Scaffold this active site. Structure first.
Site, PDB file in Angstrom:
ATOM      1  N   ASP A   1       0.794  -1.237   0.000  1.00 30.19           N
ATOM      2  CA  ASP A   1       0.000   0.000   0.000  1.00 30.19           C
ATOM      3  C   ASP A   1       0.825   1.285   0.000  1.00 30.19           C
ATOM      4  OD1 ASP A   1      -2.713  -0.865  -0.344  1.00 30.19           O
ATOM      5  OD2 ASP A   1      -2.603  -1.733   1.668  1.00 30.19           O
TER       6      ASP A   1
ATOM      7  N   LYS B   1       3.033   1.308  -5.149  1.00 29.97           N
ATOM      8  CA  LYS B   1       3.773   0.671  -6.249  1.00 29.97           C
ATOM      9  C   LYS B   1       2.960   0.554  -7.538  1.00 29.97           C
ATOM     10  CE  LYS B   1       4.636  -3.135  -3.855  1.00 29.97           C
ATOM     11  NZ  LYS B   1       3.890  -2.699  -2.642  1.00 29.97           N
ATOM     12  N   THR B   2       1.693   0.073  -7.446  1.00 31.05           N
ATOM     13  CA  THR B   2       0.806  -0.083  -8.625  1.00 31.05           C
ATOM     14  C   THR B   2       0.367   1.275  -9.191  1.00 31.05           C
ATOM     15  OG1 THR B   2       0.145  -2.253  -7.791  1.00 31.05           O
ATOM     16  CG2 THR B   2      -1.238  -1.330  -9.550  1.00 31.05           C
TER      17      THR B   2
ATOM     18  N   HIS C   1       3.743  -9.209  -1.100  1.00 31.09           N
ATOM     19  CA  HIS C   1       5.121  -9.363  -0.639  1.00 31.09           C
ATOM     20  C   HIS C   1       5.716 -10.725  -1.047  1.00 31.09           C
ATOM     21  CE1 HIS C   1       8.635  -9.550   1.867  1.00 31.09           C
ATOM     22  NE2 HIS C   1       8.126 -10.562   2.583  1.00 31.09           N
TER      23      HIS C   1
HETATM   24  N1  LIG Z   1      -2.869  10.320  -1.247  1.00 32.12           N
HETATM   25  C1  LIG Z   1      -2.243   9.426  -2.020  1.00 32.12           C
HETATM   26  N2  LIG Z   1      -2.653   8.155  -2.028  1.00 32.12           N
HETATM   27  C2  LIG Z   1      -1.899   7.356  -2.837  1.00 32.12           C
HETATM   28  C3  LIG Z   1      -0.797   7.719  -3.610  1.00 32.12           C
HETATM   29  N3  LIG Z   1      -0.278   6.609  -4.262  1.00 32.12           N
HETATM   30  C4  LIG Z   1      -1.043   5.616  -3.864  1.00 32.12           C
HETATM   31  N4  LIG Z   1      -2.063   5.998  -3.026  1.00 32.12           N
HETATM   32  C5  LIG Z   1      -3.189   5.177  -2.549  1.00 32.12           C
HETATM   33  O1  LIG Z   1      -2.692   4.209  -1.648  1.00 32.12           O
HETATM   34  C6  LIG Z   1      -3.452   2.983  -1.779  1.00 32.12           C
HETATM   35  C7  LIG Z   1      -2.520   1.829  -2.093  1.00 32.12           C
HETATM   36  O2  LIG Z   1      -1.810   2.099  -3.323  1.00 32.12           O
HETATM   37  P1  LIG Z   1      -1.247   0.977  -4.341  1.00 32.12           P
HETATM   38  O3  LIG Z   1      -0.716   1.560  -5.585  1.00 32.12           O
HETATM   39  O4  LIG Z   1      -2.256  -0.107  -4.553  1.00 32.12           O
HETATM   40  O5  LIG Z   1      -0.078   0.340  -3.469  1.00 32.12           O
HETATM   41  P2  LIG Z   1       0.759  -1.004  -3.605  1.00 32.12           P
HETATM   42  O6  LIG Z   1       0.262  -2.062  -2.749  1.00 32.12           O
HETATM   43  O7  LIG Z   1       2.172  -0.600  -3.206  1.00 32.12           O
HETATM   44  O8  LIG Z   1       0.722  -1.291  -5.087  1.00 32.12           O
HETATM   45  C8  LIG Z   1      -4.542   3.267  -2.813  1.00 32.12           C
HETATM   46  O9  LIG Z   1      -5.756   3.675  -2.193  1.00 32.12           O
HETATM   47  C9  LIG Z   1      -3.935   4.396  -3.637  1.00 32.12           C
HETATM   48  O10 LIG Z   1      -4.917   5.152  -4.339  1.00 32.12           O
HETATM   49  C10 LIG Z   1      -0.376   9.115  -3.580  1.00 32.12           C
HETATM   50  O11 LIG Z   1       0.562   9.632  -4.184  1.00 32.12           O
HETATM   51  N5  LIG Z   1      -1.176   9.886  -2.753  1.00 32.12           N
HETATM   52 MG   LIG Z   2       0.160  -3.224  -5.965  1.00 28.51          MG
END
Ligand SMILES: Nc1nc2c(ncn2[C@@H]2O[C@H](COP(=O)(O)OP(=O)(O)O)[C@@H](O)[C@H]2O)c(=O)[nH]1
Ligand SMILES: [Mg+2]
Ligand SMILES: [Mg+2]
EC number: 3.6.5.3
Lengths: 392, 13
Positions: free
Chosen positions: A20, A23-24, A83
């Site tokens: 979260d 990354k995506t 992970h």
């Molecule tokens: N405020 C904010 N939320 C973000 C940002 N990047 C990601 N998020 C939010 O964080 C959550 C997890 O992001 P995600 O890309 O799925 O993370 P992952 O598990 O690393 O791939 C989602 O609700 C995204 O919309 C950002 O730059 N700003």
């Molecule tokens: Mg992801």
């Protein structure tokens, strides 16, 4: 459209870091901003997030592949949901990483998988890491921002990455994905660091010649041929080779190369060839040894590794293994029994666990850091590993 | 060796 010729340099990258942290969203932002600015196909969050299953080394991993271009280079990029997918991808080498984009949320700072991905990155040989400090739209101060930057640099330096020299982009993957020009500029900055900081990787064809031996047969009055798929480099007729592993190292000369019953002047990386050897007898060469450019690979018996143990669902063991476990280690074209040393205070390794293992094989095999292997036992694949440090 | 499209095999002389 000339890009169909694929003449631009090619770099394999990916997004790593804690669940979260973004990354995506960053992956979708990179494809979208680069499409708008230079031309290409934009990819949405949902397309990347819904990662298909892909099999590595007998292991199922969920991996999404995307590609994007900068004016001078082509990128193939990997992004995974969990992970465990990063653990498996990194250990098996199922996704090549010439460089990694470590995503760190400015709101939480480094988290347990942030540390684990840097640690694994070092052990599996990920050579470069660039940092995208994400969610900066949620942190309006500077004391916390400069603090997280400082903690990231120290964390990278703790695992031998050059923390002081690491490019760190402060951005917002979401706002850039939403089209805010100020935040899109931070995506271009990141892509600029992909260009400037990750050097062009060395192509398998330019690496020193290596062929893992499979079959061995004699051609009456002409010598011994060994078959295999050229792993890297080129072998030419007239060049000298070393025959490394299992037995004492031998020297020979390539006197012929054949592929699909066609005689060639050379054998190239990825080609299924036969190599005719000067003055080597059929009984003096065997499966599992390698043909290699002289002095480029040594035989070893003991090494440090990072191993992932298959879960029950992946078709691995149903129960843990303990110290005393003497399984077979599959290196390229053969298997070898080895004795394992687990970390201090560790008595058992559960199915699905990943751990550092110090292995001592019953005989030597040609190996260098980064060589992958499988662990097999009567009569299934129970693990996958990577050589982290050769010990002798 | 002995192959022909992609499986292990060879020759050399
Ligand atoms: N405020 C904010 N939320 C973000 C940002 N990047 C990601 N998020 C939010 O964080 C959550 C997890 O992001 P995600 O890309 O799925 O993370 P992952 O598990 O690393 O791939 C989602 O609700 C995204 O919309 C950002 O730059 N700003
Ligand atoms: Mg992801
Ligand atoms: Mg903290």
């Amino acid at each position: 459209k000339e890009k169909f010729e694929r003449t631009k340099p090619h770099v394999n990258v990916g997004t790593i870091g804690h669940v979260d942290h973004g990354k995506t969203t960053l992956t979708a932002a990179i494809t979208t901003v680069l499409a708008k600015t230079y031309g290409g196909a934009a990819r949405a969050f949902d397309q990347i997030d819904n990662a298909p299953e892909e099999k590595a080394r007998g292991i199922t991993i969920n991996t999404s592949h995307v590609e994007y271009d900068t004016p001078t280079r082509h990128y193939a990029h990997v992004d995974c949901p969990g992970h465990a997918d990063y653990v498996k991808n990194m250990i098996t080498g199922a996704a090549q990483m010439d460089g990694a984009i470590l995503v760190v949320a400015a709101t939480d700072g480094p988290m347990p998988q942030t540390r684990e991905h840097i640690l694994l990155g070092r052990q599996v040989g990920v050579p470069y890491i660039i940092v995208f400090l994400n969610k900066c739209d949620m942190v309006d101060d500077e004391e916390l921002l400069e603090l997280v930057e400082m903690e990231v640099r120290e964390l990278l330096s703790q695992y031998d990455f050059p923390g002081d020299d690491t490019p760190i982009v402060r951005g917002s993957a979401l706002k850039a994905l939403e089209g805010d020009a100020e935040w899109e500029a931070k995506i271009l900055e990141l892509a600029g660091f992909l260009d400037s900081y990750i050097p062009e990787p060395e192509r398998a064809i330019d690496k020193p010649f290596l062929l893992p031996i499979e079959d061995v047969f004699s051609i009456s009055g002409r010598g011994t041929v060994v078959t295999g798929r050229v792993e890297r480099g080129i072998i030419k007729v007239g060049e000298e080779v070393e025959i490394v592993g299992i037995k004492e190292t031998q020297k020979s000369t390539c006197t012929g190369v054949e592929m699909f019953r066609k005689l060639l002047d050379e054998g190239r990386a990825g080609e299924n060839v036969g190599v005719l050897l000067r003055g080597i007898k059929r009984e003096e060469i065997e499966r599992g040894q390698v043909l290699a450019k002289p002095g480029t690979i040594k035989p070893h018996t003991k090494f440090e590794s990072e191993v992932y143990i298959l879960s029950k669902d992946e078709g691995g063991r149903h129960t843990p293994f303990f110290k005393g476990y003497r399984p077979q280690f599959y290196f390229r074209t053969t298997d070898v029994t080895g004795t394992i040393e687990l970390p201090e205070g560790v008595e058992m390794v559960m199915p699905g666990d990943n751990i550092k293992m110090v292995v001592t094989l019953i005989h030597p095999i040609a190996m260098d850091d980064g060589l992958r292997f499988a662990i097999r036992e009567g009569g299934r694949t129970v693990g996958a590993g990577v050589v982290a440090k050769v010990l002798g | 060796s002995c192959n022909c499209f992609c499986y292990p095999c060879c020759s050399c002389x």
